[model samples]
Target chain A: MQIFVKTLTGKTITLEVEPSDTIENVKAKIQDKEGIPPDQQRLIFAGKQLEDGRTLSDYNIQKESTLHLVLRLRGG
Target chain B: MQIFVKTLTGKTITLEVEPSDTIENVKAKIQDKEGIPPDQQRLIFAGRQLEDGRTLSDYNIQKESTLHLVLRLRGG
Candidate 1:
């Protein structure tokens, strides 16, 4: 199934992901496409922060669903 | 049903809204909660930008669903 990752800057990254793919795996894809590190990407789906170990199916995310990508704020 | 609005700064605003509520109404709620005006709130759901006229039910937004709130940048 295809899913979408939207950045705060209004850029949308569309990817073909499987239900069995873990959130961390998806974050890797985002890193590949957008150059964001997996640790710096916080994905939110269905009103909750997505955990790295859970599959997309665990959150009931279906085809064409969107995951919001909020960048982590790092302190100096 | 209750929906969540997530900001880039990692703030999540939860509000009780009806399916019949329009996207504009939801924007108003965000404005109320975060002090961001309706026009500056860009709400995205399911990989698509939401239209002001559409209701939550029209987009299949049920209880506990989330909409990403991206701010519109104004030119100087």
Candidate 2:
């Protein structure tokens, strides 16, 4: 299935993902497409932050779901 | 659960909805928040245009999913 990643700038990025895919996998894809490091990308859905170890299905992420992306500053 | 509606102009509107809600119901909520008539809204997800009679669960619309909204011409 495909999902959208909407940034604060109002730009939306589309990514094809599977229900079994981990949050880390999604972040890596985002990094590949947007050049943003995985650690710098914080994904939120339904007012909850997604963890790297969890699978999309863990959050019930279905087809065409949209995940909000917030960029983190490159620091501790 | 909550879902987002993204307009052409880069605005995102959030709505509280249920998986059992029909496409028509969603349109009505959009009307409430956006003041656009239900008939004037077109919702798309995963490259498929939603039919008014179908429920969000039928389309696998999970929590935090985002639907793209396109305005239809009044004359149509």
Enumerate the candidates' DockQ scores in order. Answer: 0.04, 0.01
TM-score of chain B of each: 0.92, 0.94
lDDT accuracy of residue A22 in candidate 1: 91
Tens-place lDDT digits, model 1, residues B1-76: 7898876556789988999999999998887887988886667776456778889999899999987776753320
Candidate 2 achieves a global lDDT of: 0.88
TM-score top scorer: 1
TM-score of model 2 (CA atoms): 0.50
> Model 1: residues >4 Å from true position, as ranges?
A1-76
lDDT of 1 at A17: 96
After the best TM-score superposition of candidate 2, give how far the Cα of residue A69 lies from its true spot, in angstroms.
Answer: 33
Score chain A of each prediction against the true chain A by TM-score and list the results: 0.91, 0.94
